[PDB]
């Protein structure tokens, strides 16, 4: 058995579900937090200054 | 010396170790340690200090006692590569004073008010207790009060978190003028935090 | 011209407004029912105009404080 195509047929399950707040498939099913908008962790939307570049 | 009784309270609290305030301190810290982090009280422990700081005997003003740990900003040793000057953190106490910490916690617990001032009320080995004055900017009495109606302006919401209180302005190096404030006034952020 | 103008709806009464809404809903049910077979309506603008008429009657009813 290998790490390539042999063990990639075990991908019959999910770790991210479609989040309510943003409709993106980023809601982790174990931590209960969307990794795109942060629903289930915070009221505000997660946005960081490293998501774009320094404006200079 | 026809002095008001507020003067006598201030005299009693000038040197509290050698007055009757020491006995009250030993009797009061037992009750104060049992209380919560942010405890509301009927009357200020030092009424003259509160009145000179801005307390009035009217509705829409709240006085709260806050317990803050003693010592500086306890910090974590970095787990990644540092240049040996940014590696040590035991002897580093931050730029946030304990009075500002207590004021910000009082502002946190009481979201619909504003922090007006605060003052030292007592301390022991592990704690410093500060009494923080808060104002209700949506009570009608404070709206009518012309000496407190400045707090209804939009620029006054969030005073203790934007460093506008008296401990905040002291912490931003604005207690004085002239020499030494070349990098503090009008703001620490204006000079790239070089002052302070 | 139109199915029924909103001025005529203001002219009507509460019971007549309810009767007109019942008849309009029944005719819209019939028109959408014939299209379940896929056959195009003989009056293709009729369905949209009846829905707009139902909207206008509901607007007049809500203005007059009926529900």
């Amino acid at each position: 058995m290998s790490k390539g195509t042999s063990s990639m047929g075990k991908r019959q399950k999910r770790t991210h579900a479609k989040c309510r707040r943003c409709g993106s498939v980023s809601f982790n099913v174990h931590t209960k937090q969307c990794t795109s908008c942060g629903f289930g962790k915070t009221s505000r939307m997660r946005t960081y200054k490293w998501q774009a570049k320094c404006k200079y | 010396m026809v002095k008001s009784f507020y003067g006598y309270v201030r005299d009693a609290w000038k040197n509290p170790d050698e007055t009757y305030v020491n006995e009250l301190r030993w009797e009061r810290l037992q009750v104060w340690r049992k209380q919560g982090s942010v405890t509301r009280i009927e009357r200020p422990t030092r009424i003259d200090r509160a009145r000179s700081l801005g307390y009035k005997a009217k509705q829409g003003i709240v006085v709260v006692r806050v317990n803050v740990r003693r010592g500086g900003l306890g910090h974590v040793r970095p787990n990644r590569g540092r240049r040996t000057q940014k590696m040590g953190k035991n002897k580093v106490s931050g730029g946030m004073s304990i009075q500002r910490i207590a004021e910000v916690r009082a502002d946190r617990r009481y979201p619909n008010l504003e922090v007006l001032n605060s003052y030292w009320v007592g301390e022991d080995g592990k704690h410093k207790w500060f009494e923080v004055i808060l104002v209700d900017p949506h009570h009608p009495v404070i709206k009518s009060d012309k000496n407190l109606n400045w707090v209804c302006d939009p620029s006054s919401r969030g005073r203790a978190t934007r460093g506008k209180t008296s401990a905040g302005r002291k912490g931003r190096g604005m207690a004085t003028r002239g020499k030494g404030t070349e990098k503090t006034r009008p703001s620490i952020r204006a000079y790239k935090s070089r002052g302070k | 011209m139109a199915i029924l103008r909103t001025s005529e709806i203001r002219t009507m009464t509460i019971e007549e407004r309810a009767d007109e809404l019942e008849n309009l809903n029944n005719e819209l049910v019939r028109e959408r029912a014939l299209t379940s077979a896929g056959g195009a309506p003989e009056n293709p603008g009729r369905i949209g105009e009846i829905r707009r008429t139902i909207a206008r009657i509901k607007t007049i009813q809500h203005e007059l404080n009926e529900i």
Binding site: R14, A17, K18, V25 | - | -
Partner: protein, 51 residues
């Protein structure tokens, strides 16, 4: 027989009816300038980002 709730089946229903060609009269009206849309797909390909 994956066991969907109501919203999952509704999303799969919308995905199913999105996967249809453009009508003929749209192509005729547009002078054949609108001949496809990005939502065409086949079930035996990239899976839906639905559930």
């Amino acid at each position: 027989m994956s066991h969907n709730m109501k919203g999952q089946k509704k999303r799969l229903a919308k995905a199913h009816k999105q996967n249809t060609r453009v009508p003929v009269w749209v192509i005729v009206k547009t002078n054949r300038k609108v001949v496809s849309h990005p939502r065409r797909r086949h079930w035996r390909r990239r899976s839906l980002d639905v559930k």
